[PDB]
Design a protein around this nucleic acid. Structure first.
Ligand SMILES: Nc1ncnc2c1ncn2[C@@H]1OC[C@H](OP(=O)(O)OP(=O)(O)OP(=O)(O)O)[C@H]1O
Ligand SMILES: [Mg+2]
Length: 757
DNA sequence: ATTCGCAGTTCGCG
DNA sequence: CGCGAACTGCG
């Protein structure tokens, strides 16, 4: 099982390093034979010798062209012969590719911007994480002595806990008597103790939670203080850090640093991403949280250190369980894209498509295009129209059915052969003309990209069928996450057409897939109203909510199933309309804001203020309560009593202050053109932190009139006595708007609700 | 740093 | 105050 790939330089030569474990043994393979290259299209084959003389220099040493080869490639399905220019070192290309393209005898060059490590996997035909090997893995987490100081790693690490299959152990240098706690002399003795354990446990996957930005960054800066060689890797190297765009990540060579934080962010969407809520949302079991202020206060006095070692023991055991459930999900995802697990688990969806097509373009012998310069990327500022959101029928309806298309946008690409190489190809015999935009796509041959999208949806349906055949609630819950990732990955190919930095950028292909679907969802809605006589309530892009105004649930289900028989046969190719779910009652506020319930006791909310992160907890709590009462048995008279019991309770001072709103800071400190209630909290207290993009600023609005921007004052600087809370504003700006937008369909102009006296 | 459609707060500002 | 620009997060 190829774990990862790498390359180093020995005396000006490249040495590919293949990290793999096979038959239960770790092994490194070195390949000094592989050679970098990039293709060049020439006007004539007589001017190749005058091109074989181009010379540059990287660091004061001459750059030449090693070997030259003549191959036949296919540019967007068009045959072409380009010259393959081999070089001695991968870094020779960026020093000479710009001098070669400026040559008057060349037309253009391709495949000059690609990592030499990923090039070895694209060529040769190697897929990481491919095999039946059982990977030995352990998770670890650390506890720090954190005062409210300034420097990052000024406080020492107190206890490094780790957990594998044998259990969770803690290593501290303080007097703690527990079965799983290892006591050492000083902080230096436990860091070298952790190295002794990592080398002894022999793991291939190092699991951490936010270890990219904290743990490895903390242990490193702490070893700078103690002068310790943090040789974690199989190669014997210290954990290397690579900056990804803005943030950074840490890799351990010879192993796989599995940071669960970037993976779980995309896998499941939750209000908070603390390890307590993640373990609760995945395993249904509560986990306690002790804070650094509680840890520091407990370590200074030397008392209550049993909980700190108990909490740290939980962090290692919880991280290992999570890292064990999500590893097969990222292992297969690494097999699809064909790159290292460390890259795939933390890279964007746009790069996963980039790595996948480059591997396929080498199989199809397709010469991949290039990324745009400033000129071409400026042309791609064009926008297109896509998505038909129907104005919903405001009010409460019953016995509603949600019939949504199954992978609408990818199926349109597969069925209509939507591809840049099929777009307006003059000469073919069969065309598929797109609505409104008028683009036509050749169908004589399977175009590049639709042929790849077919097998991706087959890998998702296999996971969908495993869910039905699985009785384990947690094991089937992970499969729901896997089939959901393939859905997001498939639609990324459609958005990849609209991506300005995409190699296979085709706005026409993107605008056509949006032209379709808009035609399909409007066609499908009219077939339900004119025939069968459904009352379509609201549609977004893939489906709609339809019902019969008076028929019971039995008639609506049967008639909807017959409608599925009378649409799928009419829809061509991969286009299919499926029965996703029936619902007892459902409220539709406005566009993309609605609530719905199953026949079984549960509530599903989409777009409403409950899911919004930047709202007061009382606004989400009350809105969920008035929704829970409405969908259970109507009883709006009882729901109105709920909207008044909190406003009257808001007259007196609130419960221990919820009413915390959360808005992170985008842009950069002062790059704003307008300051709201937050940002003003960032403008103040800035002389503070770096105020880097992505910092949540939670404030509390108090005092009285005017601002807003001048009435907050966050949460860390709050006092219920000297700083009189408002107990208002939230009755007009938080709670009441998120509620009136619901009850207004019943005839309440907010004249009711309050007042006293 | 896949695409676009979407409701909404906030408020400087003639 | 009504309207628009900026800003936030969700689908
Ligand atoms: N991030 C996205 N960007 C653009 N279009 C998207 C995105 N996610 C989805 N879409 C597209 O817009 C809607 C549609 O995603 P559905 O919620 O309707 O779910 P499925 O149909 O894919 O999969 P199912 O049958 O429910 O199992 C998808 O085509
Ligand atoms: Mg969805």
């Amino acid at each position: 099982m190829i774990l990862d790939t790498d390359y180093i330089t020995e005396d000006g030569k490249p040495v590919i390093r293949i990290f793999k474990k096979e038959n239960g043994e770790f092994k490194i393979e070195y390949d000094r034979t592989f050679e970098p290259y990039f293709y060049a299209l020439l006007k004539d084959d007589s001017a190749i010798e005058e091109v074989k003389k181009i010379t540059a220099e990287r660091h004061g040493t001459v750059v030449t062209v090693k070997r030259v080869e003549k191959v036949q490639k296919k540019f967007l399905g068009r045959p072409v012969e380009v010259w393959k220019l081999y070089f001695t070192h991968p870094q020779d290309v960026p020093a000479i590719r710009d001098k070669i393209r400026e040559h008057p005898a060349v037309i253009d060059i391709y495949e000059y911007d690609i990592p030499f490590a990923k090039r070895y996997l694209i060529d040769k035909g190697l897929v990481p994480m491919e095999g039946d090997e059982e990977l030995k893995m352990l998770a670890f987490a650390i506890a720090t002595l954190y005062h409210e100081g300034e420097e990052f790693a000024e406080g020492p690490i107190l206890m490094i806990s780790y957990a594998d299959e044998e259990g969770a152990r803690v290593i501290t240098w303080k007097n703690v008597d527990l079965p799983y706690v290892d006591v050492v002399s000083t902080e230096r003795e436990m860091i070298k103790r952790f190295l002794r354990v990592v080398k002894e446990k022999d793991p291939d996957v190092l699991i951490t939670y936010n270890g990219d930005n904290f743990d490895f960054a903390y242990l490193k800066k702490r070893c700078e203080k103690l002068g310790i060689n943090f040789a974690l890797g199989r190669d014997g190297s210290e954990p290397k850090i690579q900056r990804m765009g803005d943030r950074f990540a840490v890799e351990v060579k010879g192993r796989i640093h599995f940071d669960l934080y970037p993976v779980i962010r995309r896998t499941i969407n939750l209000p908070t991403y603390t390890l307590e809520a993640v373990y609760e949302a995945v395993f249904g079991q509560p986990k306690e949280k002790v804070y650094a202020e509680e840890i520091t206060t407990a370590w200074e006095t030397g008392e209550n250190l049993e909980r700190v070692a108990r909490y740290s023991m939980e962090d290692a055991k919880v991280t290992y369980e999570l890292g064990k459930e999500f590893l097969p999900m990222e292992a297969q995802l690494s097999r699809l894209i064909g790159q290292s697990l460390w890259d795939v688990s933390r890279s964007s969806t746009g790069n996963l498509v980039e790595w996948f097509l480059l591997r396929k373009a080498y199989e199809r012998n397709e010469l991949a295009p290039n990324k745009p310069d400033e000129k071409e990327l400026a042309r791609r500022r064009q926008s297109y129209e896509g998505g038909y959101v129907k104005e919903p029928e405001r009010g409460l309806w019953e016995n509603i059915v949600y019939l949504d298309f199954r992978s609408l946008y990818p199926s349109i690409i597969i069925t209509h052969n939507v591809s840049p190489d099929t777009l307006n190809r003059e000469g073919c015999k069969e065309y598929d003309v797109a609505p409104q935009v008028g683009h036509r796509f050749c169908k004589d041959f399977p175009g590049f990209i639709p042929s790849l999208l077919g097998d991706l949806l087959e890998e998702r349906q296999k996971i969908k069928k495993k869910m039905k055949a699985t009785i384990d609630p947690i094991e089937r819950k992970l499969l729901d996450y896997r089939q959901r990732r393939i859905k997001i990955l498939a639609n990324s190919y459609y958005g990849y057409y609209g991506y300005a930095r995409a190699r296979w950028y085709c706005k026409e292909c993107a605008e056509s897939v949006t032209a379709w679907g808009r035609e399909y969802i409007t066609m499908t809605i009219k077939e339900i109203e004119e025939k069968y006589g459904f009352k379509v309530i609201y549609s977004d892009t893939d489906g709609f909510f339809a019902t019969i105004p008076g028929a019971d649930a039995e008639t609506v289900k049967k008639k909807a199933m017959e409608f599925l028989k009378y649409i799928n046969a009419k829809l061509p190719g991969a286009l299919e309309l499926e029965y996703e779910g029936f619902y007892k009652r459902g409220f539709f506020v406005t566009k993309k804001k609605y609530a719905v319930i199953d026949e079984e006791g549960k509530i599903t909310t989409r777009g409403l203020e409950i899911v919004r992160r930047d709202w007061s907890e009382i606004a989400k709590e009350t809105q969920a309560r008035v929704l829970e009462a409405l969908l259970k048995d109507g009883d709006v008279e009882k729901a109105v009593r709920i909207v008044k019991e909190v406003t009257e309770k808001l007259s007196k001072y609130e419960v221990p202050p919820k009413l915390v709103i959360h808005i992170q800071i985008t842009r950069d400190l002062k790059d704003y053109k307008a300051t709201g209630p937050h940002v003003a909290v960032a403008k103040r207290l800035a002389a503070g932190v770096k105020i880097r993009p992505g910092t949540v600023i939670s404030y509390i609005v108090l005092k009285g009139s005017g601002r807003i921007g001048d009435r907050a004052i966050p949460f860390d600087e709050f006092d219920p006595t000297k700083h009189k809370y408002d107990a208002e504003y939230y009755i007009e700006n938080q709670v009441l708007p998120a509620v009136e937008r619901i009850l207004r369909a019943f005839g309440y102009r907010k004249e009711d609700l309050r007042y006293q006296k």
